[PDB]
Amino acid sequence: TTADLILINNWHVVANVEDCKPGSITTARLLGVKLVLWRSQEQNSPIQVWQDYCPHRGVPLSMGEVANNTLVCPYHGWRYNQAGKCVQIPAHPDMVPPASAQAKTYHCQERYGLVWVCLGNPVNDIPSFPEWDDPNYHKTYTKSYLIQASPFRVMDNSIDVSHFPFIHDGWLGDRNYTKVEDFEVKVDKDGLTMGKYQFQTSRIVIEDDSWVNWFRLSHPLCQYCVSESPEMRIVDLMTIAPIDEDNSVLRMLIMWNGSEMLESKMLTEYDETIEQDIRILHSQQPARLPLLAGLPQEIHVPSDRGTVAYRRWLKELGVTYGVC
Amino acid sequence: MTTADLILINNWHVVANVEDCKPGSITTARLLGVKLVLWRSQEQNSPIQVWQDYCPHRGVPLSMGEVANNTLVCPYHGWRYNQAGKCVQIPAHPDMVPPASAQAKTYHCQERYGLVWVCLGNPVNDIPSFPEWDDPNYHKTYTKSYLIQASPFRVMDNSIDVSHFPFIHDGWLGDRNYTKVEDFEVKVDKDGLTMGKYQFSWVNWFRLSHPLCQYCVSESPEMRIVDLMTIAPIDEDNSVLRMLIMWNGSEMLESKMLTEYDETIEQDIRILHSQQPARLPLLAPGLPQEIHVPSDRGTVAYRRWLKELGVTYGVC
Amino acid sequence: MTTADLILINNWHVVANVEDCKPGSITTARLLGVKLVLWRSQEQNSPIQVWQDYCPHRGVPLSMGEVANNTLVCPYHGWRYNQAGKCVQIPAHPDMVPPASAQAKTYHCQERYGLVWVCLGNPVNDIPSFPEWDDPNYHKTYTKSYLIQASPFRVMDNSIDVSHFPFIHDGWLGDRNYTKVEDFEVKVDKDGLTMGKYQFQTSRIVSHIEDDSWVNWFRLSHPLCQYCVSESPEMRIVDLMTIAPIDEDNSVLRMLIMWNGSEMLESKMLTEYDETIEQDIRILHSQQPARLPLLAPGLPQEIHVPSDRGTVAYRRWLKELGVTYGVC
Ligand code: FES
Ligand code: FES
Ligand code: FES
Ligand SMILES: [Fe+3]
Ligand SMILES: [Fe+3]
Ligand SMILES: [Fe+3]
């Protein structure tokens, strides 16, 4: 579509590396752009991420096939090498393909088992995830969640902490303990950091009903969360793929230093609470996130200081896509 | 799809039947482009609140919450709104007095004839009158609601139209062998529009003081039937039709009367859904202009009335 | 919606097959954003009327009515319209003189090749010619009608294209081992767009295994109809493809197929066309932008190679004709 600079020139997860097998074709959408992801059959072949579009007659390349180290358009069989250049036009086998015959290619990097894509010029680093190679931690990935809400409303809901005892009653919050103690938030050059805050709840992951959480966003659509009890530490990297201004894909990478056998329960806790959030996200109007300044204007109370700082951060960053 | 037409925004409109709103219940409706939430506390005889279905904190519909004591509680962070619409409790800050702006947008609501009437503006006009409501010799019945994909003014146009009876209502209100329409009278003054007696047996007349409500009278030597038809204007292109039917014959006719009304309402809806343009064409304006014959005098009068009232919503 | 393009409004378009308009029948169609009603009286050999599907009294579709004698009767108040579209009876006022405005909007209709052609405007062009129609050497069959969510001009672009045969029609109209496209000529002139004889290699289900060299040729005098001749040393197949432009983004494709060979080939002829038409539709539905891009020195612009000379010439011809509907 018509996204902004902090968005176009940043890295976004569009797939799990396990989604992209050798010789395979898959698709995604990012910032209004249709993407094709493909790999040759070679062992550990790299992933190409291109705009899903043959410039000859406008057919999606994802409808084609991988042949050797090339992607072949189904309509007239033009073949594109790994750099996106047309190397063969079958109707004219002795013709040099015109230089214009080329797919639009994007930057792709595999990191944390996720496929990261930059549609522009990649001036930012991929967000840090310190536990990735820590041998004390195990990992698991949630399924993806397609959410009919603005990506910035999706992240707003993930920075929100006061909703835990209501839509997450029995999982992350306690309807008996609704008060939200004070906490600190700072927005600097490291992005947005929400400081330590304690909340009363036990988790399927029992007398352990005191958890201290904090989180950081260096990237407005990624969040690194740390949730700690005396017994265990759980971290997660949530990535929100902005399909367009009104639709999102949520993925979460979870790591924990307890027993590896907790994996099933971890995925259940996250699945339950994600779907609880999605019920609210789908209902919110207007769909795009209102920035600080028909329907009434938003109201803020002190426990909204982090979601207020997020709206302020988005404005300073110059975000206009998916917001209002 | 909202309106500034005063005759619409400053008027009363039926949005529900009172039996639909039990104590402790939450229901939804739409009126003139606005999403409404209707709720009652669980105490007996509790009043009906009708609000814009929206929490001003983070934009969640209040209808997704729950009724607790005398309050409607938003599901997202549990802000509690009392029957007057004021937020009385913000659970994250139990000792804080909520901001003055933590307020639901509330609308006027009145129960009359067993229906829930709502005014979204200033209630300048009054609810249409219905004399037989106070008459112990008349039984009453309510049709189900009918959702119609047509402009509410085209819906009312079809109810003022009387020459179609022998065609789409053949066998029920008309007879294909008697198609000629005899002369009848219609006047528009500032009591509204009033169809003079006519007959296709049954002698009928009707009047509208409200452009989307109709009071019909149908009389025979045996008995007389009155109905109050109300057309809820959801937006410019969608309507909810209800009828309140009263009659002074045997009460056991109810099942048949409901069937006769159901048959002919559905015959009308088949026409209403097909008509183009969707908005009602007013007089003197790639589709040709309307044609009028003498038996259209009532629907012509209706188009003239709507122009004098200044209607622009759902009309062209 | 509608178009002011004269080449489209003042031209003839197929909207139905004559077999779907029985005496006494009412059917519907849509053409260039206009809703049509097609009807016939019960009489033997009655003509087909094609009118705007609209009663000017209160705006009801006349197609919801019924045919009575030689009139179409609106269901709402029973106004009766004769074959010329004039209202002859207003039942509420049986003695009145119906106003001149009580008249359906009527269009030009003409049955040819067993198809119903309609002109919404002033017919300055003729229905395209299909010489084999009157040849008793030739058998005929009609495909079913295919609703396609693509611009009618993209649908025709795909039918002018020949280099795609060995790919999406591999095993039917081409061979993945013979993908080179021989040279051929194209002309845009008084006749419209003509692709000269083009030889390609394939065996086909409608002929013998060794009959594996075919020669195609086609002419469009009308930008949404195509007369195509496909010939081998063993058989000659001709077809008249017609694309009904429902609106800018939706089309109805019909094909009338004739061949000079055994009448028993009919089932195989319909199988081949159905299989290849559906392969073409899979591509058509995927193409973006939806409207056909014209020539012009967001999405990257089209590239053209020499075997595109016919589809390039088509884009040039459409601009020369003044087409703006369904093109970009
Ligand atoms: S459209 Fe891709 S090769 Fe022609
Ligand atoms: S959205 Fe209603 S309490 Fe926060
Ligand atoms: S709308 Fe056709 S006769 Fe009245
Ligand atoms: Fe949550
Ligand atoms: Fe009726
Ligand atoms: Fe084809």
Side-chain angles (χ1 to χ4, degrees):
Chain A
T1 299
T2 59
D4 308 290
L5 208 71
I6 180 83
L7 299 184
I8 289 285
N9 295 333
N10 223 323
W11 296 95
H12 309 276
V13 171
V14 300
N16 189 286
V17 168
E18 283 197 322
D19 302 332
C20 309
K21 295 96 181 165
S24 70
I25 298 170
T26 57
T27 60
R29 298 175 182 262
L30 181 62
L31 299 172
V33 179
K34 290 170 62 179
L35 305 178
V36 55
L37 297 77
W38 71 273
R39 299 177 60 187
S40 82
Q41 203 86 54
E42 299 186 347
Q43 194 177 339
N44 270 83
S45 55
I47 300 171
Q48 281 72 230
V49 182
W50 302 347
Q51 181 175 37
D52 189 4
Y53 196 79
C54 183
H56 178 220
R57 292 293 186 263
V59 169
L61 290 171
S62 63
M63 288 171 60
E65 61 175 329
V66 176
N68 304 304
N69 295 10
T70 69
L71 181 59
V72 184
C73 176
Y75 196 11
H76 312 88
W78 294 18
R79 310 203 181 185
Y80 298 85
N81 66 14
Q82 280 175 151
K85 181 190 171 59
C86 176
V87 297
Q88 183 180 347
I89 290 170
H92 307 288
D94 297 331
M95 193 184 52
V96 176
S100 58
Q102 62 171 288
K104 169 68 189 115
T105 70
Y106 302 114
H107 298 104
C108 175
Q109 173 68 225
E110 300 173 37
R111 184 76 56 79
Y112 320 131
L114 305 171
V115 182
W116 297 79
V117 178
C118 185
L119 302 188
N121 298 319
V123 312
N124 306 98
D125 300 314
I126 293 172
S128 301
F129 191 46
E131 284 75 21
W132 173 250
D133 281 312
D134 190 324
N136 299 298
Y137 288 74
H138 316 279
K139 62 171 182 297
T140 191
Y141 302 78
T142 67
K143 61 177 170 176
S144 307
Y145 295 84
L146 180 61
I147 304 178
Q148 307 168 93
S150 163
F152 297 102
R153 281 225 185 253
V154 176
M155 185 57 85
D156 185 26
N157 164 263
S158 193
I159 294 171
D160 193 287
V161 292
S162 52
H163 67 274
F164 288 8
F166 296 99
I167 65 169
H168 304 317
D169 185 23
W171 295 89
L172 302 180
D174 194 324
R175 62 186 179 264
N176 301 336
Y177 292 76
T178 60
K179 182 173 183 52
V180 173
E181 279 308 322
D182 287 316
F183 58 88
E184 74 210 303
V185 304
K186 39 190 156 77
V187 177
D188 49 4
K189 305 174 180 188
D190 300 329
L192 187 145
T193 301
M194 202 215 35
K196 302 254 208 77
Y197 77 98
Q198 323 200 0
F199 61 112
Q200 158 81 218
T201 190
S202 52
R203 309 162 70 160
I204 294 169
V205 174
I206 61 171
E207 271 197 87
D208 214 8
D209 53 56
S210 62
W211 293 81
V212 278
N213 285 36
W214 71 273
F215 58 73
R216 175 185 167 202
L217 296 75
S218 57
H219 175 312
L221 292 177
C222 298
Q223 178 189 48
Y224 171 64
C225 287
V226 181
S227 187
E228 193 167 6
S229 78
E231 295 200 15
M232 194 185 39
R233 197 160 173 272
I234 306 168
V235 310
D236 61 62
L237 188 70
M238 180 187 86
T239 54
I240 305 307
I243 289 187
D244 59 24
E245 293 193 78
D246 305 294
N247 295 276
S248 310
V249 180
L250 180 154
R251 300 176 172 84
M252 295 194 186
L253 160 57
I254 307 156
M255 302 188 81
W256 69 101
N257 63 4
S259 167
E260 191 178 324
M261 285 333 185
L262 304 174
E263 176 176 5
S264 274
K265 299 180 187 81
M266 203 83 56
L267 288 169
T268 290
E269 188 197 78
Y270 277 75
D271 181 67
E272 293 282 328
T273 56
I274 291 170
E275 293 287 4
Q276 285 157 358
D277 286 310
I278 289 176
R279 181 184 157 258
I280 295 294
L281 284 156
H282 280 169
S283 73
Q284 286 179 281
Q285 296 291 321
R288 305 184 179 164
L289 180 67
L291 294 189
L292 305 176
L295 296 173
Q297 192 193 137
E298 288 182 321
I299 299 176
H300 312 291
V301 293
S303 52
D304 298 328
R305 61 178 65 86
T307 58
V308 171
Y310 184 58
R311 289 155 173 72
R312 187 172 295 118
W313 188 36
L314 294 179
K315 192 57 188 173
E316 291 166 9
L317 294 171
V319 175
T320 68
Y321 187 90
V323 298
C324 65
Chain B
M1 212 187 258
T2 194
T3 181
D5 294 357
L6 293 189
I7 189 70
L8 296 178
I9 193 74
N10 288 333
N11 225 325
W12 296 89
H13 307 282
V14 173
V15 301
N17 187 305
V18 167
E19 72 184 333
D20 308 332
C21 309
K22 296 307 184 176
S25 76
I26 300 162
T27 58
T28 56
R30 298 166 180 273
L31 181 59
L32 295 176
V34 178
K35 289 160 57 183
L36 291 323
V37 54
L38 295 73
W39 70 276
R40 301 177 59 188
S41 79
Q42 209 177 353
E43 290 172 342
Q44 200 48 251
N45 309 324
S46 54
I48 297 170
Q49 282 71 239
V50 180
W51 298 350
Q52 183 170 38
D53 187 6
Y54 195 79
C55 179
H57 183 214
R58 290 294 182 263
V60 171
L62 293 167
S63 56
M64 292 174 51
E66 64 182 4
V67 174
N69 304 311
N70 55 325
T71 64
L72 185 58
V73 189
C74 181
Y76 195 2
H77 318 86
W79 294 19
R80 302 206 185 182
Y81 297 83
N82 66 15
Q83 285 170 122
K86 191 176 112 152
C87 179
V88 292
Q89 176 180 350
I90 291 168
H93 305 297
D95 293 308
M96 192 191 81
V97 163
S101 56
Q103 257 277 344
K105 184 164 208 167
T106 66
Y107 299 115
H108 299 106
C109 175
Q110 177 180 351
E111 307 182 20
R112 191 138 167 81
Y113 316 132
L115 310 171
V116 184
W117 299 77
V118 170
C119 183
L120 304 179
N122 286 331
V124 161
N125 312 76
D126 287 357
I127 290 167
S129 67
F130 193 44
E132 287 78 16
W133 176 257
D134 302 291
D135 189 334
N137 312 296
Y138 282 80
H139 308 98
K140 52 181 157 48
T141 193
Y142 299 86
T143 70
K144 57 167 172 175
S145 300
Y146 295 84
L147 177 60
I148 303 175
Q149 283 97 61
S151 155
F153 297 99
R154 278 223 186 252
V155 176
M156 182 57 81
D157 183 41
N158 159 264
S159 283
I160 292 166
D161 194 292
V162 300
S163 52
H164 70 266
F165 287 14
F167 296 96
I168 65 180
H169 301 318
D170 185 31
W172 293 88
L173 296 180
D175 189 322
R176 68 180 169 266
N177 300 119
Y178 295 113
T179 62
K180 177 169 191 304
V181 176
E182 295 302 334
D183 211 289
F184 61 90
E185 196 201 279
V186 52
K187 54 171 177 290
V188 181
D189 49 50
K190 293 179 179 179
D191 292 346
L193 185 149
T194 59
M195 166 91 178
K197 293 184 175 173
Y198 69 101
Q199 44 172 4
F200 257 111
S201 284
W202 299 102
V203 177
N204 324 275
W205 71 277
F206 61 72
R207 80 169 175 257
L208 302 73
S209 54
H210 185 309
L212 290 181
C213 299
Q214 191 186 35
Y215 172 65
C216 296
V217 179
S218 186
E219 193 152 358
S220 64
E222 303 183 299
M223 54 158 319
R224 90 193 266 271
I225 308 161
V226 302
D227 57 69
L228 185 70
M229 171 179 81
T230 58
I231 307 304
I234 294 189
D235 50 47
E236 299 192 63
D237 298 306
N238 295 276
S239 312
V240 182
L241 185 154
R242 296 176 176 86
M243 305 194 60
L244 166 55
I245 304 168
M246 300 192 81
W247 74 103
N248 59 8
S250 170
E251 76 183 321
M252 294 304 302
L253 303 161
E254 176 177 0
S255 196
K256 294 176 200 77
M257 303 200 51
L258 286 173
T259 284
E260 170 164 317
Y261 279 80
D262 185 60
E263 292 292 322
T264 62
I265 291 171
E266 292 286 357
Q267 285 155 356
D268 284 315
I269 288 171
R270 168 180 172 262
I271 293 296
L272 285 162
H273 279 163
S274 76
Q275 285 179 289
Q276 296 290 317
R279 291 150 163 65
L280 181 69
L282 297 188
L283 291 178
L287 294 178
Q289 183 192 335
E290 291 186 323
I291 309 168
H292 311 284
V293 294
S295 50
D296 299 327
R297 57 179 65 85
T299 56
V300 168
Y302 184 61
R303 291 154 169 72
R304 280 171 183 151
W305 189 38
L306 295 175
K307 184 118 66 185
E308 296 169 11
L309 292 174
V311 175
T312 63
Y313 192 83
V315 302
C316 56
Chain C
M1 217 192 78
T2 54
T3 167
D5 292 352
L6 284 192
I7 196 54
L8 299 183
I9 295 287
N10 291 338
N11 216 330
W12 298 92
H13 309 274
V14 174
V15 302
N17 188 293
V18 169
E19 275 178 15
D20 289 316
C21 303
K22 276 159 175 42
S25 68
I26 296 166
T27 59
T28 57
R30 312 180 85 103
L31 180 61
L32 299 170
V34 178
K35 297 172 52 184
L36 301 180
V37 58
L38 301 78
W39 69 274
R40 298 177 61 189
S41 82
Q42 192 69 59
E43 297 178 15
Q44 42 155 9
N45 277 342
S46 54
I48 296 166
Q49 282 72 230
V50 184
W51 299 350
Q52 187 173 30
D53 187 8
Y54 196 78
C55 182
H57 182 218
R58 293 291 182 267
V60 170
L62 290 171
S63 61
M64 292 170 58
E66 73 190 9
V67 173
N69 208 34
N70 287 23
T71 67
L72 178 55
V73 183
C74 186
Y76 195 10
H77 311 92
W79 295 17
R80 304 200 184 191
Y81 296 86
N82 69 11
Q83 283 179 339
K86 185 182 179 51
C87 178
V88 295
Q89 189 180 331
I90 294 172
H93 308 287
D95 297 330
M96 93 177 275
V97 178
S101 57
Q103 158 83 38
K105 173 57 186 145
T106 70
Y107 300 116
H108 298 104
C109 176
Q110 264 274 326
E111 300 175 35
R112 192 145 312 154
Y113 321 126
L115 309 164
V116 183
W117 301 76
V118 176
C119 182
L120 302 181
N122 303 125
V124 308
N125 310 88
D126 278 330
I127 294 175
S129 78
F130 189 46
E132 282 79 12
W133 173 257
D134 283 322
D135 186 328
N137 302 321
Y138 282 73
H139 306 109
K140 61 165 134 47
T141 188
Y142 298 83
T143 68
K144 64 182 170 187
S145 69
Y146 296 82
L147 182 55
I148 307 170
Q149 311 179 227
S151 163
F153 297 100
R154 286 220 179 254
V155 175
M156 184 55 86
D157 179 31
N158 163 261
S159 191
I160 285 164
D161 191 292
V162 293
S163 56
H164 69 277
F165 293 0
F167 294 94
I168 65 170
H169 304 317
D170 182 24
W172 294 94
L173 271 45
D175 186 328
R176 59 179 177 276
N177 298 318
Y178 296 98
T179 55
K180 173 169 168 140
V181 178
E182 306 303 313
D183 184 44
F184 58 92
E185 291 193 293
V186 72
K187 312 173 299 200
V188 175
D189 61 2
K190 301 63 60 180
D191 281 10
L193 169 63
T194 303
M195 179 192 73
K197 294 275 178 173
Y198 164 62
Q199 187 170 226
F200 59 107
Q201 267 247 39
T202 187
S203 56
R204 290 170 72 170
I205 199 172
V206 293
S207 195
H208 300 291
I209 290 74
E210 304 288 348
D211 187 27
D212 63 9
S213 198
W214 288 82
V215 187
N216 277 22
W217 175 97
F218 55 73
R219 177 186 170 189
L220 294 77
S221 58
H222 180 308
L224 288 176
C225 305
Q226 183 189 45
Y227 170 49
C228 182
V229 179
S230 190
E231 192 167 352
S232 81
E234 309 265 297
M235 194 183 26
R236 188 167 185 276
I237 305 164
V238 309
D239 61 64
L240 184 67
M241 194 187 58
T242 54
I243 304 168
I246 294 187
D247 54 40
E248 286 199 84
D249 301 306
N250 296 270
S251 312
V252 181
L253 179 150
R254 296 173 175 92
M255 297 201 63
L256 163 57
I257 303 154
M258 302 190 75
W259 68 104
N260 185 342
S262 171
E263 189 176 7
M264 304 318 298
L265 288 168
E266 180 170 351
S267 183
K268 277 164 172 169
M269 198 71 63
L270 291 170
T271 292
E272 186 194 87
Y273 276 80
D274 183 61
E275 293 280 338
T276 58
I277 288 169
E278 289 291 2
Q279 294 159 349
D280 286 315
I281 289 177
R282 168 185 165 261
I283 290 302
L284 287 164
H285 281 167
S286 76
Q287 286 175 290
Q288 296 295 315
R291 292 176 295 160
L292 180 72
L294 297 190
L295 301 177
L299 293 168
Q301 61 179 245
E302 292 184 324
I303 310 163
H304 309 290
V305 296
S307 55
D308 300 328
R309 60 181 64 85
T311 57
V312 168
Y314 183 58
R315 288 155 172 72
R316 168 167 67 88
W317 185 41
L318 292 181
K319 181 129 73 200
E320 297 183 357
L321 293 166
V323 172
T324 70
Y325 192 81
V327 303
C328 70

